[PDB]
Structure 1
Amino acid sequence: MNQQGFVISNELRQQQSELTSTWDLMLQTRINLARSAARMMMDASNQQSSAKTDLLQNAKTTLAQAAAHYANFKNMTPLPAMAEASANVDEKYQRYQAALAELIQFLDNGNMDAYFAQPTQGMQNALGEALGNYARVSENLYRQTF
């Protein structure tokens, strides 16, 4: 009973903390890719490999890091109050995660057109918005416990 008002608080914290993390790494994959293709563009400098080293490799890491963070969120089932806001973020993460994953395939094999053809911004926009919605319900899921 009463003392159970501590396991709900901690969960809201961890579930949310997990989202801030994931989001970060995602936008932390987007720039590595960006910084990756940039140099992949018509230029020289690091004449090593052939479209796959440091920067490209770091995005493969960041996205994997975000995903592990996310898998936790996906695991520990939410609450009947975080229900909707949850499936929504999952729904948007699904798309934006797939998106970056593919961006990684392209840069990987040299698919510059494809890499630059993908409508990523909006994929990111949707999740960001869906993240704001969830953050709104989450932070609010306490403004009635006094």
Structure 2
Amino acid sequence: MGGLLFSSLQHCQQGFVISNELRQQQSELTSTWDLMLQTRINLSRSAARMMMDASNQQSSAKTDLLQNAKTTLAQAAAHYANFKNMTPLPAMAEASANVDEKYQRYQAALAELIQFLDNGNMDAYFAQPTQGMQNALGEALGNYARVSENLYRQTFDQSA
């Protein structure tokens, strides 16, 4: 914004300390959603290959699309672990708990789907209610985003 933003160095610096945590927290969450979606996509392209069958050598249990799924899923929980390590801010603590809930469920879901397809079991792949659990975490993360956005807005002058 521009002009008259902060009452003093104490007020500017206070707003920096909150915004710099917020930022780091949000970086971790953003990278965790992003690698869970790449994992879902990489399960999808595996399964579609599976379903074209006749196939070509090894495709299902082993070979490398599923290995890719295993890698991006194992990078998303690492970012979540960095998130979980961080100081819960008072203003963010409900949002953050609601996030862990749906995160836990969508991680587990994703991990399971990897084992279904590694077992070649396409009916279980499709039987799992994956999208409801993906969306729930989407809504929890958009709920965190909003609450971070309000906390962030209170750090500088309310008048533009």
Same fold (TM over 0.5): yes
Name whichever of 103-112 and 25-34 sits farther off. 103-112
1:107/1:80 CA distance change after superposition, 3 Å: same
Matched residue of 2:153: which SS? coil
Paired residue for 1:27, among 27, 32, 37?
37
Q: CA deviation at 1:77?
A: 2.5
CA shift at 1:6, angstroms? 2.7
5+ residue gaps, structure 1, are none
- 1:26-51 CA-to-partner distances (Å, cap 9, x unmatched) read 01000100101111124245422643
Give yes or no for contact 1:40–1:51 (8 Å, CA) kept in 2: no
After TM superposition, what 4+ stretches of structure 1 lie above 3 angstroms from structure 2?
A: none
In structure 2, the partner of 1:110 is: 120
CA deviation string 1:14-73 (max 9, x = no partner):
100111111011010001001011111242454226432111110000000101011011
Q: Distance in 2 between matches of 1:11 and 1:130?
A: 19
Change (3 A) 1:113 1:45: closer
Aligned-partner Cα distance in 2 for 1:77–1:119: 33
CA contact (8 A) 2:15 2:155 kept: no
Alpha-carbon offset, residue 115 of structure 1: 1.0
Higher RCO by CA contacts (8 Å cutoff, separation 6 or greater): 2
Q: CA 1:46–1:7 in 2, change beyond 3 Å: closer, same or farther?
A: farther
Greater Rg by CA: 2
Task: Mark the CA change 1:92 to 1:133 in structure 2 (over 3 Å): closer, same or farther.
Answer: same
Q: Distance in 2 between matches of 1:94 and 1:145?
A: 32
TM-score (norm 2): 0.84
Look up the SS of the partner of 1:82 in the other structure: helix
Structure 1 residue 8, shift from structure 2 partner = 2.2
Distance 1:41 1:145 in 2: 53
| Percentage of matched positions with identical amino acids | 99
What is the CA–CA distance in structure 2 between the aligned matches of 1:127 and 1:144, rounded to whole Å? 26
Task: Kindly state the Cα deviation for residue 7 of structure 1 after the two structures are TM-superposed.
Answer: 2.8
Mind listing any 5+ residue stretches in structure 2 that lack a counterpart? 1-12
CA change 1:50–1:125 in 2 (3 A) is closer
SS for the counterpart of 1:45 is: coil
Task: Give me the CA root mean square deviation.
Answer: 1.4
- Return the alpha-carbon distance in structure 2 between the equivalents of residues 12 and 123 of structure 1: 25
Aligned equivalents of 2:52 and 2:152: distance in 1? 53
Taking the aligned partners of 1:110 and 1:50, their CA distance within structure 2 comes to: 6
